[PDB]
Design a protein around this ligand. Sequence first.
Ligand SMILES: [Zn+2]
Ligand SMILES: [Zn+2]
Ligand SMILES: [Zn+2]
Lengths: 71, 1168, 149, 103
Amino acid sequence: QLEHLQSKYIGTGHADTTKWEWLVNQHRDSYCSYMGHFDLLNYFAIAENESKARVRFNLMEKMLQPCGPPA
Amino acid sequence: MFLYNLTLQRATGISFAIHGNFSGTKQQEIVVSRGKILELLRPDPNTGKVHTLLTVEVFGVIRSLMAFRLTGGTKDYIVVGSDSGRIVILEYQPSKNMFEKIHQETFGKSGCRRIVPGQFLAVDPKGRAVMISAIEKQKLVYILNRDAAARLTISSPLEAHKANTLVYHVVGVDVGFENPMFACLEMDYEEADNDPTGEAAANTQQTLTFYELDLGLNHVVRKYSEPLEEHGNFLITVPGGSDGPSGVLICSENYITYKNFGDQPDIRCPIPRRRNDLDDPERGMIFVCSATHKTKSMFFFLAQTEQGDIFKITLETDEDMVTEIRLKYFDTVPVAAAMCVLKTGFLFVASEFGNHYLYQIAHLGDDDEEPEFSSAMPLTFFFQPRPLKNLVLVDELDSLSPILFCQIADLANEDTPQLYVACGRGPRSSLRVLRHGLEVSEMAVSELPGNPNAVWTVRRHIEDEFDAYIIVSFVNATLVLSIGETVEEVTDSGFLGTTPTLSCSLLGDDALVQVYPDGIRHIRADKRVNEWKTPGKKTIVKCAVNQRQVVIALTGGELVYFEMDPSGQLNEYTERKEMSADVVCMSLANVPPGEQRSRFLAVGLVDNTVRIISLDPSDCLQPLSMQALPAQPESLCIVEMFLYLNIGLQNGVLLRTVLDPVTGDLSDTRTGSRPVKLFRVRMQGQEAVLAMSSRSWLSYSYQSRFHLTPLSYETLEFASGFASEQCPEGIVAISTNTLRILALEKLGAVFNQVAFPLQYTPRKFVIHPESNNLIIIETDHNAYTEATKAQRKQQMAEEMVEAAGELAAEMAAAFLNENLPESIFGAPKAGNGQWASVIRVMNPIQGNTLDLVQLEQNEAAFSVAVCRFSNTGEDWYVLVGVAKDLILNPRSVAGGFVYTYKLVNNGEKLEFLHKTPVEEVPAAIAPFQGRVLIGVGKLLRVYDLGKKKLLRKCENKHIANYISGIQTIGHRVIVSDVQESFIWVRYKRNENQLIIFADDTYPRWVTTASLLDYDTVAGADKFGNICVVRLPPNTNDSQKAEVIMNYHVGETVLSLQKTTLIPGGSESLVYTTLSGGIGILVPFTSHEDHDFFQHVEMHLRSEHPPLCGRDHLSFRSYYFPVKNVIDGDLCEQFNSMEPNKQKNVSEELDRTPPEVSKKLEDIRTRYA
Amino acid sequence: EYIGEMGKDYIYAVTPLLEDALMDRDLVHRQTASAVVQHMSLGVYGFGCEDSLNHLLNYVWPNVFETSPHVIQAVMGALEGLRVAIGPCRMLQYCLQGLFHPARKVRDVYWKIYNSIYIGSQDALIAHYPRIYNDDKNTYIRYELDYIL
Amino acid sequence: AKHHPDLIFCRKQAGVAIGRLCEKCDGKCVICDSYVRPCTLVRICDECNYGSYQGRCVICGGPGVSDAYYCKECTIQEKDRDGCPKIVNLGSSKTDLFYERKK
RNA sequence: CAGAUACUGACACAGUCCCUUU
RNA sequence: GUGUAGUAUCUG
Ligand SMILES: [Zn+2]
Ligand SMILES: [Zn+2]
Ligand SMILES: [Zn+2]
């Protein structure tokens, strides 16, 4: 079977995947990638008059449950 | 069409900083990492300035940076975790002046994924293990060790995976010769995704988990995990073991907590609060960075808040238990991202936005006047800020990090366009002016009537440290002077200077020889004159002076040979030569202490042929090599330190040739059809050349690289070296029929900057096409205007007076007459949806505002332009787009307004005329055909001038998303969307209808665009990609557009312009990054060069892997595959390897390393 | 496969042979042409020859709804080899067309293809995600990407 | 071995142990079973290198004589960032001819 | 459920026995 | 020449 590799990696869906868990992973991946690039955080810290530490803290806090509660 | 990516200025954005003994001796260096550039720099403990030693590129973003040393060692290593997906350990090699790859381990895929270690990196303080952890579920631990080979070793990684876990910070606990222990902040979220009621989202605490590394069983297990009360952001390690207690210093919101494993209480000391804060009293207070000054005698800590206030944390304990934490306000500094407490009382502060400072510590803060806080006091503390009184500023590093707009234009009376960048953010914003050349410093100005043409400055003795001799020579007259900081007329020189002076030689240790057209007169320091008269009607032409010999030539080519003796007597040879031309240009090299004299002499003639004559009397007066020149040389000079020679021609070109009796490498470059003179100068204790033309030129040799950079100054004709005590290093130069003094302090670089202070962050600006002025506008979130802040302060300082106590409240009087500055003390960030905008007009020549317009609250300026309509004559209207009640994250507004000014009296007045209300925020304003295009969000409209408002002519609603850019050319205009790449819409004036015909396929987060000639739009992206889109030739002006170029710079770009940079250059594609980098996208000219460049790049892709280790092709294809672009940084990196590797790379292309280097420099020196 | 980098010159000749190879012929023709396309796309990666690869991609996609292990094993390999020479942006548009199909056999195949695309180049999909509007009570819009300087 | 859809790979972790290849299969890709352009070395987890399993060929399991390698396609596709490729299965086409030829 | 005829996977061919111990 | 998986078509 070729599904061994696809199972050990989180975020992998199946035929019974609901939209909510797809969108929450989509938002979580974007939140994680925001802190990676330095200029992608400079743009956020210049757009709103805040500090880099504050933006990072807010992004980390928002990861607990993005896209609202489930159904 | 292929493009070549060069670079002009490197990024100056600091993200991480570490300190340690990276060299080996007892001197500490700083390794500062840019966004994707690794840099090394050290400060001078004797003067305080900081120099640059290495600027190697890693070709990839860096997410972590740590330093460590082994037990019982004296060298510090560097551990780098980045996007490469590997772990790299470096080592600095002082002998090779470059880094050294040591270890490389792969533990996953590539890319900033979720489950990929590399974000958080921690190291054991004792230097026995290292932990690299991801943001979730991918904790990994290595085991570092040393073997009998005295080399670092890496064992197999140990997994510490834990599903459904978010990691906030990872730090290494200090333990004295026990098993390593690491701390992390986990927070499970499994229960938060199973309760639809949402009650599990709240009341979920995070734990402080300690991880135990079993050094005997080779596994890692977690032991302690206790819940916390409130969320924290970062942790500070405490030196433990045998010197102090072991634990952590969790810095939560509005609190600081100390926790230790086992049985130990907790200490919570609230953070001190600024006195009489003007902001909203519902905003939390958190820390941003920390430091450590661990010392065997006593140790303390440092911290910094959002407002940039340094504290001083000191712990109190008896044997192991910590009793209290004692805070104390230290100083106030601009907010920084990292600090490095250096030895010898030095502090390095690297600001996240602006220049970088460096302070020295005079007092450690003992027995001060302000009280100290503690956790023992029951129950909201306060303190009063003040000037520093504890630190002084000794050095500042320039950095144009937050650049938001750029515009290249020529506004002064020259031909080289200047750069007008609008950088900075917050109250400390500035608008610098960048021009090619070096910084010019002056000390004193003196008036010397007449017509001088030359001057000399030679030391009286070889052991003298102060220059004394000055020989100011007119066309025929002379005037001896001196420098003693009291420069006046001197008479007791006794030179009998009644004849024109052509040189001032140094024949011996202190012997000087003057030149007069009637012979040669020796002038010794002692009364020993050896005068040699030359009878006849023919005078001398020139003289080749040297530290040990003198060579002279007469009219018609009559050679005279001179050679000195140890006794101190002159000598002459009995042979005279015949020439086929006349003496025009001479040169002579220096003598090293390791040899008796030089090797060869260079002689120039009218026939444009250089003649090489040996100094050996056995075969003297005998040419060896012959080489003609395209044009007649004017002056010649020789530089030392591998040695090269400089050839100056009659026109404005300078030729570089390696030192060789036979002809060799040739380096042709332009210096303006005027004579060029080259003299010997001194820099930082090193030799250099100096060419003079219509503009001054300075060339220096440093680390196998030559830079021919001009000086940002007016026309000059003469210069000479200078060194004294008042100035660290200067240059004695003359001016137009007068005297001057020149000084150079800054290290060799380009793009000199002059800073103009501002008040807020500049968004956009335009240039007046008649009076060359600026219409700069500003807008910042979370700010108060000049009136609202004042009225809020007045209202606040009135209710507190009536606090039912002593009527005797006189502090309001002492408070209302003293306001702290904002450029050093920050700004009072208040609110969540507040705005402030200012419109400013500035003179680009010198900094002085002409008019200021202040908008009211909740009014954000987003666009400005200058237009001229048709129904009205020469009336330069100014339109400003203003929003209303703009909230960022829950985006929702209630309309906006558009202003209209008049700009009367040739550019220093502005009267309000009328305003027009709009139901949506405008973002794009573009004038064309005597009208204006207004893009109000999704809607697109065209407006016309009226009497009290603006008239809506045509309406189109087809844009899929928010409009954020509009450019007009001819009958075609381009609308820049926020998600779609581009939309082409044509305006027809027959029925007043806008129709869309062409669009793009791949969505892009476009931020800026610029049409090249007529159809190719050189766009950009929010992530860093740069693309060029071209319309098919067969389009009916449904119809997509093809893409002809793709690239990935790796940094956000917000500026694109095509304009020639140097006189006689070509059309470039100069852009500007968001970190401070300036680059160009110049194309290739011929076809036989593109293949060579592609071959060189392909060979270096495998013969020179990146320092971090990552596929260069994959890095440049981060989001979209590369297309028709060749990297130029990698090609220019060819100049720095080992000779064997250089030969191995060069031999496939059947070329020599000098041949490859010459054209690599030639292509760069032609377009810029 | 053998020539590798030299296949950007003979790329045009084989195209009007793969074009009529990817027809309703026997399974062997489409099974072999899938490997041909896979090697052809892998050999020319990074040299900007996606103009013909995009045209060739339009024929591989219909031959995905198969049942024999060999043909699907070749077709998924061809798609994976094309996704590195063209880019995830083009493959995401094809995959998203029928992700939430109201059938099951199509959904399984589409989810398998999406997982294959999702495992590799995870960070490259951040900028290529579509925009979804909000429902009654949830936040489905990334407001942080709409900031304007 | 991609020809037999029965074999199961390890995928545990990498390490400092380099895999070896035997005479029967010297220049074959571990996954692709190709023969062109070896690019990168092969690392195996410590569970696949202990005592009787030390210095054995990755694919079949004989006495290794030369180092293993990855082809260029595996490096471009980043198929080497998965763990160790050592086979932990006996197989069905190699453990049946034993009893078929015993008679 | 079975028979027959075609086809695919650079599939492999005394492969050899390498803690089974007194 | 044999064995180890998989697939297609006609007939019963
Ligand atoms: Zn083998
Ligand atoms: Zn392979
Ligand atoms: Zn294994």
